[PDB]
Subunit: 285 residues, 2 copies
């Protein structure tokens, strides 16, 4: 049954169709933000220190693996604050490590002050509180509402309810709220703070992530994946579902182009960058 289901028959075609869609609708190719050796070392040092109180040891290779999503999904042309950039590198990486941990080993009393220390190092006083609150909310939500009936209801009812849940759960709201200081762009800053930024980009991020993590997630009993709403065994049902999802992505991209140029660049680089990172990364194979 579902615990043994797979999208493996569709990997090649779906990858090519995602890329075809991005070339047509976004056009601008993702590029990688470059960090100097010293900047990368500072990020890795900060990640190791954040996760040290947890008794967790993590290799440089694994940190670099996680950080790629930041290097690829941010928008290099628009960056103004590289201190905020390194904070997102660190926040992103330590939250991945936390998520990959056995939940029985989550110690919020040790982890939250580390998240706060990161925010306070890299951001101004105002920004530090916004980014910390988003980080605290993400990690708290994950805990509070696992094995919750709410997750089951939202994830099994309809794509729309599912994506409503993923606005927070896939981490985009947190991403926006820690990323706006990178750009110092007034419009982007407000869209981030109202969460309209996250609401516009959630489907594009989530459909991609869900496709490439489905086999692993389903093998582990995890229900937070939109492809669980269709029978991935029936080639015909799958293809119809996948096309509806591509259509969702396209509608969002087309609406995103109504935003101001800088903001639209950042949103589209995020969705398209995430896909590039996702298909190159060992986490999803």
């Amino acid at each position: 049954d579902i615990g043994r289901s797979s999208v493996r028959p569709y990997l090649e075609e779906c990858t090519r169709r995602f890329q075809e869609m991005f070339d047509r609708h976004v056009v601008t190719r993702p590029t990688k933000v470059e960090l100097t050796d010293a900047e990368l070392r500072e990020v890795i040092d900060d990640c190791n220190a954040a996760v040290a109180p947890l008794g967790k040891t993590v290799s440089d290779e694994r940190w670099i693996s996680y950080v790629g999503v930041v290097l690829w999904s941010q928008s290099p042309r628009h960056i103004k604050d590289m201190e905020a950039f390194k904070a997102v590198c660190v926040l992103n990486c330590v939250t991945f490590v936390w998520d990959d941990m056995d939940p029985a080993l989550h110690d919020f009393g040790l982890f939250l002050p580390q998240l706060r220390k990161i925010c306070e190092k890299y951001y101004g006083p105002e920004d530090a509180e916004v980014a910390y609150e988003a980080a605290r909310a993400f990690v708290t939500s994950d805990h509070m509402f696992r094995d919750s009936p709410i997750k089951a209801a939202l994830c099994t009812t309809s794509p729309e309810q599912y994506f409503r849940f993923r606005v927070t759960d896939i981490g985009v709201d947190f991403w926006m709220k820690m990323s706006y200081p990178i750009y110092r762009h007034p419009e982007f800053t407000e869209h981030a703070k109202t969460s309209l930024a996250a609401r516009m980009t959630t489907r594009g991020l989530t459909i991609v992530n869900d496709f490439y993590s489905y086999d692993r997630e389903v093998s582990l009993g995890q229900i937070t994946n939109c492809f669980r709403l269709c029978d991935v065994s029936d080639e015909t049902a799958f293809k119809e579902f996948f096309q509806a999802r591509l259509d969702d992505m396209i509608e969002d991209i087309e609406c995103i182009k109504a935003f101001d140029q800088l903001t639209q660049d950042v949103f589209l680089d995020l969705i398209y960058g995430n896909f590039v990172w996702t298909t190159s990364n060992k986490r999803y194979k």
Copy 2:
């Protein structure tokens, strides 16, 4: 054109159908929170002081009209903090007055510090920052993106995109982020802070407000109304659209019932309470 269209032919039937839906799906009838004479006095005094720098003088009757949405839509069974309650009364009322003002007269330099003063009076340090940030975001969104292509794109594309804009624009995210301290309920606090609370309740709130404000908004050229997505002149198109909105509200209500009992009470009291207030208030006639 659409500027002279009307849903007046449908008022009685739609009102009856909304009520029948709530009686079936929510069941628990809205009740009105009691303020003592002293408490209402305090609220009105605070309202007048906030809008005085704007040269605004407002009658008790007008303030009482605005505050009814708070007295009816909050959940009296679950109130724990009446200071937070009065803060919502004040914040709600002064935001109404701001929104009814000629935009040329909006003076953020004068108004924002008044919003901050209200939050600092009634909330603890942590809650004051969350409520104030949500008020600031709401009022800043309203300004920044008032004649924005984004608003047009979102409001005209699909119901989905429209409701995505209204999460912030109808003010529910702000409502949730100023209301959670009333209840001091951990789960509700978190759903408020992640905006999941707002995402679950926006369609119920927005569909009802939109129906009862359509005629006035369309006469003023305003585009923020879901009934603009159909031809309200065509009775069969309208009835089809209306049913689709009712189905949306019912789906949200049924998913809301998967939340913990206190949270679901609050969410449902809000949607149903707003309907009761909307149908009895002079603002929509």
